[PDB]
């Protein structure tokens, strides 16, 4: 309108909080391949 534009400017405000979880680690899984594949069985450990 002439040289001027209509703008909504804030007249009041507050502070808002926002949470953000970022994963940086995970459970350190470890496998005993021999115990998993063959358990206690000697005949399996031989073939493995």
């Amino acid at each position: 309108v002439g040289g001027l534009y209509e703008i909504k400017i804030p007249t009041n405000f507050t502070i808002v909080g926002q949470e953000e979880f970022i994963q940086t680690n995970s459970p350190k899984v470890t496998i005993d391949c021999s115990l998993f594949v063959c358990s206690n069985y000697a005949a399996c450990h031989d073939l493995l």
Binding site: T30, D32, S34, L35, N40
Partner: protein, 48 residues
């Protein structure tokens, strides 16, 4: 991380139903009235 061990069994548990009769399987197999393949006979042995 060394290979997985298992605790050694310290005793043996053996269970069987006592005082069951003999199955007599030989008496039935040695019976001289032998059937042909056409009329092959069956016997079922349990609790013996």
């Amino acid at each position: 991380d060394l290979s997985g061990f298992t605790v050694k069994p310290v005793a043996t548990v053996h269970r069987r139903i006592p005082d069951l009769p003999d199955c007599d399987i030989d008496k039935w197999l040695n019976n001289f009235n032998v059937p042909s393949p056409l009329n092959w006979e069956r016997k079922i042995f349990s609790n013996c």
